[PDB]
Amino acid sequence: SEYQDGKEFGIGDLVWGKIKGFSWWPAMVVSWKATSKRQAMSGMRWVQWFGDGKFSEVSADKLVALGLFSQHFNLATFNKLVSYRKAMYHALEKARVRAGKTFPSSLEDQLKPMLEWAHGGFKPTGIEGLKPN
Amino acid sequence: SEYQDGKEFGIGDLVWGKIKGFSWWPAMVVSWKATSKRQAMSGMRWVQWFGDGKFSEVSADKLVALGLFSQHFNLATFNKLVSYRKAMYHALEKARVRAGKTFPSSLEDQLKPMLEWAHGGFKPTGIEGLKPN
Numbered sequence: 001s002e003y004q005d006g007k008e009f010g011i012g013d014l015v016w017g018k019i020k021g022f023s024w025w026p027a028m029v030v031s032w033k034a035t036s037k038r039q040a041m042s043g044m045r046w047v048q049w050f051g052d053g054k055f056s057e058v059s060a061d062k063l064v065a066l067g068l069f070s071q072h073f074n075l076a077t078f079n080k081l082v083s084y085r086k087a088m089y090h091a092l093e094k095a096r097v098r099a100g101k102t103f104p105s106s107l108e109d110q111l112k113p114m115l116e117w118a119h120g121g122f123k124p125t126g127i128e129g130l131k132p133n
Numbered sequence: 134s135e136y137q138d139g140k141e142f143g144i145g146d147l148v149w150g151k152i153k154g155f156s157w158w159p160a161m162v163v164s165w166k167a168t169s170k171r172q173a174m175s176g177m178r179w180v181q182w183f184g185d186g187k188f189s190e191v192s193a194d195k196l197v198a199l200g201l202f203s204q205h206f207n208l209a210t211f212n213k214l215v216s217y218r219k220a221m222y223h224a225l226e227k228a229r230v231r232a233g234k235t236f237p238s239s240l241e242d243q244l245k246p247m248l249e250w251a252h253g254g255f256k257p258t259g260i261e262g263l264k265p266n
């Protein structure tokens with residue numbers, strides 16, 4: 001099947017991805033069929049970046065689980081780039097729905113509790129709640 | 134462990150492969166389990182072509198190490214087909230990472246410092262740097 005190479009991460013997985021020149025950026029692992037390109041080379045994954053919805057072929061070694069959040073969240077980039085704040089919103093919103101989390105009720109204002117939730121370890125489910133299905 | 138038939142090339146090796154009708158094209162030796170197809174016959178190797186990510190079963194005797202770069206790179210085919218230029222880029226990119234090489238930052242644009250690095254024997258690492266792991 002697809003992505004059967006021993007490396008980590010499968011379709012639907014929420015991940016951080018590192019592209020040369022950019023901060024770790026939130027993404028979702030997708031099948032190559034969604035991309036309109038080609039099958040990924042061995043040991044790579046197609047991902048779709050939150051915020052801009054583009055596709056990149058990325059090594060599985062340049063990906064980590066989104067659940068390792070405080071370790072890869074870049075606070076400077078978050079303060080500097082509106083695009084990164086938009087990216088976090090769509091990424092954490094997808095996380096929230098998967099985990100079955102709800103928050104009370106703007107952009108910054110809506111992000112704040114999702115951000116605290118993520119930074120605090122995705123409680124109560126922990127990272128387990130971020131799995132696909 | 135598959136491919137233990139005494140012949141050359143193991144999982145992860147960067148190689149040139151020839152299919153009749155075609156120049157030498159860069160590829161990576163993969164396990165049959167990545168292909169979603171049959172196990173490979175004796176003396177054969179599954180390869181995945183850079184550029185289109187498709188799979189082919191190729192005799193281990195019709196494969197050379199990517200390191201023999203200038204001897205098998207085909208300049209006529211390169212200038213003629215963009216597919217080949219794409220294949221070369223992805224192949225050299227994987228080469229670059231394995232090696233730990235770096236190139237200051239378009240397509241043919243990004244290709245120039247890579248192509249020169251390869252044509253001149255992949256210094257400083259030499260071909261020893263293209264090995265898997």
Ligand SMILES: C[C@H](O)CN(CCO)C[C@H](C)O
Nearest residue numbers: 017019022025049052054083
């Ligand atoms: C605006 C920002 O560049 C978003 N990118 C997506 C590049 O296609 C993600 C980054 C390259 O990892």
Ligand SMILES: C[C@H](O)CN(CCO)C[C@H](C)O
Nearest residue numbers: 151152155158182185187216
């Ligand atoms: C021409 C094409 O884009 C590259 N092919 C791979 C297709 O099987 C490699 C060649 C057939 O050796």
